[PDB]
Structure formats: C-alpha cells, structure tokens
C-alpha cells in the first residue's frame, strides 16, 4: 500500500508534500 519514495526537486509522477524527506527533497507516492 505505501509506495511512495524519496525524490529531489520533482518526480516522475505522484509528486506529493506528505511528508517531506529533507529540505531540498520532497515525497512522491502514486496512486498506483
């Protein structure tokens, strides 16, 4: 259920601000 990953600037896809990974970084988790 919690695919997200750690990403830096943007992601791919399911970029999200739940819980930021860092500063810089942020969180991306998709709906699939």
């Known amino acids: 259920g919690l695919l ?3 990403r830096k ?3 791919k896809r399911g970029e999200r601000v739940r819980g ?3 500063i810089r970084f942020l969180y ?3 709906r699939r």
């Open 4 to 6: 997200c990953y750690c």
């Open 9 to 11: 600037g943007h992601c």
């Open 20 to 22: 930021t990974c860092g």
């Open 28 to 30: 991306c988790c998709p």
